Design a protein around this ligand. Sequence first.
Ligand SMILES: Nc1nc2c(ncn2[C@@H]2O[C@H](COP(=O)(O)OP(=O)(O)O)[C@@H](O)[C@H]2O)c(=O)[nH]1
Ligand SMILES: [Mg+2]
Ligand SMILES: [Mg+2]
Lengths: 158, 234, 70, 72, 299, 65, 172
Amino acid sequence: NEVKYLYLRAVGGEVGASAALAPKIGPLGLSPKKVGEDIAKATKEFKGIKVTVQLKIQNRQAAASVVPSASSLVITALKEPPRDRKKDKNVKHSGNIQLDEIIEIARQMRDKSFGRTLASVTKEILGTAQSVGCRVDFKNPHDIIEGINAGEIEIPEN
Amino acid sequence: RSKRSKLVTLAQTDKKGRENKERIFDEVREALDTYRYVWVLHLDDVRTPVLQEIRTSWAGSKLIMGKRKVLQKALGEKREEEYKENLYQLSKLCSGVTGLLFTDEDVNTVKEYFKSYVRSDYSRPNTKAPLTFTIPEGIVYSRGGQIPAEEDVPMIHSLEPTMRNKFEIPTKIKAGKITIDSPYLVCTEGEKLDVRQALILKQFGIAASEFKVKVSAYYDNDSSTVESTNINME
Amino acid sequence: AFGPKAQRKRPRLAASNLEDLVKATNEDITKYEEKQVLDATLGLMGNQEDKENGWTSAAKEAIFSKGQSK
Amino acid sequence: MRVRKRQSRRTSTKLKEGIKKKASAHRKKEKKMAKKDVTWRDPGIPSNFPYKAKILEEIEAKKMKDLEEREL
Amino acid sequence: KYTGEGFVEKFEDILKGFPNINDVHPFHRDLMDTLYEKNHYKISLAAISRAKSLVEQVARDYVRLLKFGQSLFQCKQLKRAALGRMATIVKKLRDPLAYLEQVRQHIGRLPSIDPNTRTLLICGYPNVGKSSFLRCITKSDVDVQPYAFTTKSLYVGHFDYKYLRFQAIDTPGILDRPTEEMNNIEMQSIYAIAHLRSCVLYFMDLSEQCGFTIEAQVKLFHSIKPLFANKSVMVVINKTDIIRPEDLDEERAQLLESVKEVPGVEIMTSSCQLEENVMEVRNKACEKLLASRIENKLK
Amino acid sequence: PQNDYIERHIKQHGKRLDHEERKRKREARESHKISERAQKLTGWKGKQFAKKRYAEKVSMRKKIK
Amino acid sequence: CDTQTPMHTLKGHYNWVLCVSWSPDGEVIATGSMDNTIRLWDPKSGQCLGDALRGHSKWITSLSWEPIHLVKPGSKPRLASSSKDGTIKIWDTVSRVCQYTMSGHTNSVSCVKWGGQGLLYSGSHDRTVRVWDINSQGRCINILKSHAHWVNHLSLSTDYALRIGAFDHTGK
RNA sequence: GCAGUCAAGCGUUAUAGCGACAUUGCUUUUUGAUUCGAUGUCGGCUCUUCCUAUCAUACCGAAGCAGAAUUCGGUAA
RNA sequence: UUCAUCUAGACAGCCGGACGGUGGCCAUGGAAGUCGGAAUCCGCUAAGGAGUGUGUAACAACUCACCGGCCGAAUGAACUA
Ligand SMILES: Nc1nc2c(ncn2[C@@H]2O[C@H](COP(=O)(O)OP(=O)(O)O)[C@@H](O)[C@H]2O)c(=O)[nH]1
Ligand SMILES: [Mg+2]
Ligand SMILES: [Mg+2]
C-alpha cells in the first residue's frame, strides 16, 4: 500500500476544523467526523493557536500529528491565556520570552533547518518572534540579534 | 529620437557591482590558503534546495559559486599569474556552471560521497527522454494520468491559453475544463527533448530524470599537483 | 464602503436577534402595504392608467401663467 | 477627399507695422524690468579632448611657478 | 447659461435613474442596504443634488452680473469666473461619482425578484446541495463546486407547475452565528428568508461531506426557526445516494425526529442524481405553497 | 443573466482565441501610436494631448522619486 | 505654587511629554511621552526612578493609577497606560515590569480609567468602550457599542475619590 | 478670484528671489430635501450659398457593451 | 555636454536558478508575496522582495526584482543646440 500525506492549518482544540478538508476527503472515502476528532486529539496540546497538522493515510486508516513551526512555537512559549473568537479579536502578541525558551524553540527547529549553527537557527527564531511582535529578554529581538552578532551573547551548544 | 524605451520597475533589490566580484575573488584566494583540497564541480541546472542540502552535508568545508571567469582569474588564468604552483591546470579545467569545494577530507571520502549522491530532477532540454508520456483522452487533469483521475484534480482553466499557444497542444474549454479530442503523446523514450516538451513535462510535474554532480579534478595544497577525477562524465 | 477595495464585510448596526429582525420586517411590510394602498387610491386611478391607453392631459394654457413674467 | 481652406501667407502691411510697434514696446518693457529686477547674478576641459593630461600638467606647473613668481 | 444647463442635465439624468431606496419594497431596500450601504448611497445622491443647486445658482448670478459688463475684457472675466466656479463644484464630486458608477454597474446586474409571486426558497449550510437542486429544477446557470460559498449572491430560477410560473431562489449558505457577527453574505439569505413569503426548503446533508455535522445542521434549523413563521416549510435531506436517513445511528435518528416535531414541517429525501425525487420534492413544495396562498386569498 | 455573468462566462468558455496575441500587439503598437498622435493631432485636441502628456510625465517622476 | 517659582526640571524624555499624572498617595509622578515611553519621577528630589517603561509602539495618550482602597497595605499602586497603537499596558512600578497588555481595540485608544470595583474602562477611536477585569488576568469582559464615531473622553462617578486616594481637602 | 502649501526647474556661495505640475480654505453640506435697474436698435416673409465647432443618416473605436437600448469618442458637411 | 557599465564580459536575446524559517502577525466564509492593516526580520547564497504584475474561491502555475550559462564589443541615462 501507498502512504498519502496532507498538510493543513487548524486552530488547536477545536472540533469541526476539518470542513476545509471535505474536497480532500471526497475522493479518499474518509470520515469527516473521525478526521476532525483525530485532529482535535492531536492538537489538544495547543489551545487556541493555529498549528500545522499532518494527516497520514495508509490502507484504510487516518493518523494526525502536529508539525513544529517557528511562529506557533513562539506563540506557545509566550504562554498567553486561551481565547475564544467570540470574545477576543485583534489580539496582540506582545509578551516576554526568555532566551532559554528561544534556544529551546531553536532546538525543536534545528532538525529541518538549513542553518549551520544553532546561533543561526536562534537568529531565525528571533526574526520570527520579531514578526509576531513579542519581546525577548525585555528587549527588541533585532537588538538581541545584534548583541549576538557582536558576541556579547554566546550560544552554548557548538 | 526613435529608440527603444526601457521598462522601469520599482522593486526592492538593486544589482551587484564589481565589488561583489572582488569579494568572491578575495574569498577564493583566502580559501586556497586555508583548505588543502580544491575540487572543481560541474553543477548545471541544479535546484537551490539541492545545492543547500549539499552545502549542509559538507559542513566545515567551503562551497563557492560565481562567475567562471572570476573563479579562473582568482585561481590564476596563466602560469605567471597563478596563486599557487600548478594551479592553472585546475583553473582551466573549470567549465560551465562551476563550483569550487575547498575541503580537508580524504580523496576517497569526497569521491564516495559524490559518486553516491543522486536526486530526482526535471528533464532538461537536449537530454534523453526518461519515459514515454501521453495526455489521456478526455478532460485534462493536473497530473495527466500519472495518478488516477479520481484522486487527481482537473487542470485549472487559466492554463488553457498557455497549453494552446506555448505548448502547441490542441485543447478546448468545455464547462470550464480543459479537454483534448484525442490522446496527445508528448515524448517517446530515448528521444532528444526540446524546450517545448521539457516545459510540458515540467508543467505536469514528471520528474523521472536523475541529477548528479560532476567532479572534474582536484588540487592538493602541499602536493601541488592536479589529478583528474572523471566522475559521472559519461 | 463598496467596490474593488471595499473593506466592509459586516452590517454597521446588526439586529439584536432573529425575533427582532422578523418583527421589524413584518412591520415594514405592513407599512409598505398601507402606503401603496393609499397611493393607489389616487395616483394609479389617475396618472398611471393614462399611459396604458396612451391618453395625455392637454397642454396647460399660457394664459393661466400671467402675472409671473420677469 | 474634400480639401479645406488654406491660410494665406501673403504679407499684410498693417500686421507687419503693428508687429514692429509690438516688438519695440516689448523690448522697452524688457529693458525696464531688467533694470528693476532683483535676482542674483568655467566649464573646463572637455572629456573628449585627447591632450587633457598635458593641459592639466601645464596648468599645475604654471600654478607652481606663479606661486613663487610673486613672492620672489 | 449653456454650460450650466449641460451640468444640470447630467445631474438630472443621474438623479432620475437611480432607485429611491426608502420607497422601494422593503425586501429590495434591505438587499440594497446590504449591497451598497444605504447611508453612503443616500449621501452620494444628495451630494449630486446639492451640486445641481449650486450650479444653477452660479449660472443665474453671473448672467445677472453680465448684464452690467462694460467691455469684452470684463465680460470675458465674468464668464471665466462662472465656468471656473462650476468646475470647482464638479471637482468636489469626485468620490461620490466613482462610488455611484460602481453601484450602477453592480445594480444593473442584480436578478429581478418579485416579492409577491410564488417562491421556493432554498437554504441551509454550505455544500449541502442548494445550487445543485436549483440546477436540477430550473435552467439557471449557478455554479456547483465542492467548496464553501461558491454562491456569493442570490440566484433566481423559474419553472412551471400547473400552468403557473414559480420562481426559485438559491441563497448563499448560513453559518450558525449570532446576528452581530453575521456578515453581509449571510445577510442576503437572512433577508430573503425573512421577507419572501414562500416555501422554504431547508437542505440537510447526513454524509457530513459539506464539512458540518448532523448536530450542527439541526442546530442551524432550530436557530433559524423564528425566520419562517407563517411560511410553508419543508426539510430536504439531500445526498441520499451516499447515506439514507434509514441507516443513521440512534441519536441522529432522534435528532431527525426532533426536527420533524416542529409543526408543521415535513421531511423528504432527495438525490440530485434522482430526477424523479427532485421533481417530487418540487411538486410537494409547490402544493404546500399553493394551498397556503389559496387558503389566504379565500378568507 | 445575473450577478457577474461575464466573469462566469470567461471562466466557463474562455476568451477569443486571438485575445492575448491581439492585446499584446496593441500594447506593442502603443509607442508608435502615441508618437503619431503627438505629431498628427491638431488644434484643441493637440493642446490637450500635450497637456496630459506633461502631467503624466510629472506623475511618473514623482512616483520614481 | 507657594512662591510661584520653579522647583524641579525633569529632562528624561526625548519628545513631547503628552500626559502627566500624580500617584494617588502622592509619592511618584508618571509622565507619558510622544516617544512611546513612560517615566517615573521622585518629586521631592526631582529625580528619575531607574529607566523608562517600554513596550508601546505609539505615543502615550492617557495614564491611570490603581486606586488606593484597592491597593493592599505595604504595596504601591500599579500604573495603566494607553497609546495610539490600541493597547492598554499595566505596569508594576515596585518591580518595574509590565504585567498585562490588553489588546482588544482596533484603533487609537483615547483614554483608560481604573474604576473602584476592580475594572478598567478603555475608550478608543473604534467607536467602542471596553470593560476589562484586572482580577481575571486582563481579559475583556464587555464591549459597549452605541457611539457612531470616535469616543473622545470618559468619566467615572468616583473619579475624584479615586484620584485623591486617602487625602482630603485638608490634606492630612 | 484672493490667501496659502508642495517642488521639477530658474537662480547662487549670501538655504535670498522667481517658479510649471499638483494641492488646501472661502464660495458650498451631508441622507437625493425643496424672477432684483441689459439706456439703446429688434423682428418677420421670400430666396441662395458657405463653415464644421456633427443633431440625424454611413462606417469605425471604447465601456459590466448578454440581448435590446444607451453613453463617450474618431473619420465625415 | 556631463555622467555611468564594460574580455576577472557592453547592451539585446534564449536557457537555467529565483531558496529555507514561512501558509511570518492581525483580520476573513475563504486570503499561502500578490482584497486589506501594521511589522518588514533571520539564515543560506551566485542571487533571490516577508514580493513586480498575470492568475486561483484559496493553493498551484507563470512572471520580474536579482544571479548564472551561451553569445562577443561597444552600450545605456539625463541634458543642450
Ligand atoms: N453524492 C452527491 N453529491 C452531491 C449531490 N449534490 C451535490 N453534491 C456535491 O456536493 C458539492 C457541493 O454541492 P453544491 O451544489 O455546490 O452545494 P451548495 O454549496 O449548497 O450550493 C459538489 O461538489 C457536488 O459534487 C448529491 O445529490 N449527491
Ligand atoms: Mg452553491
Ligand atoms: Mg471634425
